[PDB]
Amino acid sequence: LFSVRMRAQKNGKHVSGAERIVKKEELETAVKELLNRPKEFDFMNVKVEKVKDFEVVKFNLKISTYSFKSPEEAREFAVKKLTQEGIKEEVAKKAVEILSKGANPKGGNMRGAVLMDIETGERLEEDKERGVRTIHFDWKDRKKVTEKLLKEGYTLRTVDALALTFKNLFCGVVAELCWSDDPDYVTGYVSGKEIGYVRITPLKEKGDPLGGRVYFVSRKELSEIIECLTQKVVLIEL
């Protein structure tokens, strides 16, 4: 196995990034995809890495879709679903508040997730600008999983978020709150091993460039989660 990671920038700003974990016979293919993912970039780095240890885990979340009239109800409904994982309502609400108002305290989005104390609503990440990025995950067979899930009517964003959030749940995150920072994508989710993957539409308004992720975590488990999020290599079989 080889981890292929790429990131790309235009005028000093991240514009694109992906990761594939594949065996050598498929290394060229994966590099060609990621070299072609950015529309316009002026810098791009592609790091190829031989995988040392990795784990294969079988996906088994329940996908369910819901759609509402305004962000209010969808956000109110997401707070309800986080409540069904054990998050007290005002902690779930605190995660929603952080994302909509902008997660980075110096303005805008974070490339990575807020790590929220599941009991107190306290932000446990040391870097509130960059957050904690989950990496070293992939679908074991991405071609298969992409054609199947698209034909079920999920987007390429959904194929991606499903693998990401499912590594997060494997790594000990209790539940997740996520919506895109793309001004036009307005579908997001909450996940959790009880409630499954809960697609929720209008989680913001069209235009709103503010979006991101909040990971509800037990502080007594913080260091072992971060280590897992950022270093364990997990392939996901459907």
Curated annotation (Swiss-Prot):
Record-level GO BP terms: biotin biosynthetic process
Cofactor(s) of this protein: Mg(2+)
Annotated coiled-coil segments of the chain: none
Pfam families assigned: BioW
Catalyzed reaction equations: heptanedioate + ATP + CoA = 6-carboxyhexanoyl-CoA + AMP + diphosphate
Keywords, sorted A to Z: ATP-binding, Biotin biosynthesis, Ligase, Magnesium, Nucleotide-binding
EC number(s) on file: 6.2.1.14
Superkingdom, natural source: Bacteria
Pathway entry: Metabolic intermediate metabolism; pimeloyl-CoA biosynthesis; pimeloyl-CoA from pimelate: step 1/1
MF annotations from Gene Ontology: 6-carboxyhexanoate-CoA ligase activity; ATP binding; magnesium ion binding
HAMAP family in UniProt: BioW
Family note: Belongs to the BioW family.
Quaternary assembly: Homodimer.
Role: Catalyzes the transformation of pimelate into pimeloyl-CoA with concomitant hydrolysis of ATP to AMP.
Record protein name field: 6-carboxyhexanoate--CoA ligase
